[PDB]
Structure formats: C-alpha cells, structure tokens
Symmetry: C2
Subunit: 167 residues, 2 copies
C-alpha cells in the first residue's frame, strides 16, 4: 500500500534587511508565503521597531491574504503605539500570505526593523461561527489537511458528502 501522505512542515522566518541593525532608507521587499491546501498560515513578530507614522505612510510592514489587507504596521514596540503588531497573531484567509516591508527616504532615528516567524497549521473546517450553519448535517470530522462528514446510525451519507438520509 502507498503510504499515507503526511503534513510538510511549512514554516519560516522573515526579517528586515540588515536586521537587527538599522535598516537602509528607500528599501522595498516582498515575500510570498503559501501553505498546502487545507492549511492556513500563522505569523507573528518577535521584534518590531519602525519609524512611527500616523497611518504608516512612511515606513511600514503590510500583511495581506489575497485582496484583504490584514494590517499596516509601523511604530516601535517600545512606545507601544497603535500601529505596532504587538503580540497579535495573523492568519491567511486562504492558504496564502503576502508581506511587504517599505523603507522611505530617511529615518528620524536608527530603527532596527523587524523579525517575524510563520508556520502552516491545520484549518479546522468543522469550526463555524455562532449562528452559522454547521459544516456537517450530522457529524463533523476534522483531520490534518481536510475534513469530512458522517451520519448517525440508521442513516447514510448523501452524494453531496454532507446530507444524512434515513435508511
């Protein structure tokens, strides 16, 4: 028998150029991260020190999953402003994550940049928000990389893979 395909350990690290040193001006960097289907990406910062800007129009770290923009980060973790990431965790809405670091023409002070880490994790597609239709008619089974439905005794799974019909 062809052995069961297990999870690839997709995880990594991102850091501003020259981290932990000052980061040059007018820098531009982009990273594209993806996890296997059935897996989302979790990312968080261990270090965040950028030029503070009212709407991060100067220096910044933008996180994006597809169209939606997860947040535009900037500012120092030391001053604990509102633009900084802090310890928040970020997740990709699909299985993709796009990160961009943007350094403008000059720095008020010697900002040390940022360091981030990410890791693929299993999406529990059995998880649904309060008041939303349950992912399965009868029973929901989540496993690594996917999920499936099952029926109570006396019933049988419909061709649609969710509906349970009496038998």
């Amino acid at each position: 028998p062809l052995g069961p395909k297990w999870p690839e350990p997709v995880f990594g690290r991102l850091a501003s150029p020259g981290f932990p040193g000052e980061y040059a001006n007018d820098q531009e960097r982009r990273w594209t991260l993806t996890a296997p289907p059935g897996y989302r990406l979790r990312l968080y910062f261990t270090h965040f020190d950028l030029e503070l800007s009212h709407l991060c129009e100067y220096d910044f770290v933008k996180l994006s999953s597809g169209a939606k923009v997860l947040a535009t980060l900037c500012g120092q973790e030391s001053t604990d402003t509102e633009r900084a990431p802090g310890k928040d965790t970020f997740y990709s809405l699909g299985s993709s994550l796009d990160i961009t670091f943007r350094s403008d023409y000059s720095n008020e002070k010697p900002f040390t940049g940022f360091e981030a880490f990410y890791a693929a994790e299993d999406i529990d597609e059995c998880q649904v928000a309060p008041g939303e239709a349950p992912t399965c008619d009868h029973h929901c089974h989540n496993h690594l990389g996917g999920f499936y439905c099952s029926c109570r005794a006396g019933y049988v799974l419909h061709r649609n893979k969710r509906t349970c019909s009496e038998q």
Copy 2:
C-alpha cells in the same frame, strides 16, 4: 516534505457488525500510532454496550502506553462506570491502542460503538502552569516539531533553549 509513515492521519473504528448487535465472546484490539511530534485525538459518535460493575463483562479500553486512559461500557455513566458521551480522548504521546472485548452473552441487543480518530500536531510550546517555559526567550511551534529563538542581541546556547548576550 512530510514524514513517511505507515498509519493514516485519521481513521474509523467500529464494533463487529456495527450498527447491528455485536457477536459474543469477541476480542479485538487496534494499534494507532502517528509520526514523532503529532498526537492522536479520538472520540465516539455511537456507544451502546452491556452494563456491568467496573465494566467487567463487555468493554472498550483506551490505553496509551502503560497508563490506561479509560474503560467504557453501558449507555450512560454511573459511579465507577464511565460512558464516553461526547468527551474527547488524547494519546499521551504518539501512541494509542484500543481493545473491544465481549463476553459469552448479552441480555438486550446492544449495538456496540463507532469511533473516529485523527492525528494532530502537538504544541510543545504549550506547557502546564508552574512548569518552566520550553524556551528561554522565543518558542516556535510548527507541524511535527518546534524550535527556540532569541531576542536580537542574544544568541541561542548549544542546548537550543537558553539565550545569552553575543
């Protein structure tokens, strides 16, 4: 990547002849084991077995290594007689084996049980309060493992946990 392994990441277990009446004098055992790091989560969707004091006649024993996680029988729980309900069970580590034993006979036509299990990554970065952190500075959990990192300015010691200037 993906750690090569014989057993599937998930599966289903059911008493003989489920959902019908399970034969008498039957004893079956299952061995569930996943790759290093991961652990197994198992739960029952259906549980209908003969009742008995300390589940002596018929039973479903869930053990992980040496420690016996729990023994089950009946349809409901009493004192010294535990019934699964919707509760969840986890393998201490990466190993979990099940045993279903039926004795000579049954008064009522018991339909047995159905169970499902799935492997899930362990968050070794997670620890029971009081215990020291797995890492001195930063803990990174990922599928199948983990590793530590240090604050800027510090470097990780040979032990891959403690951090120090330089």
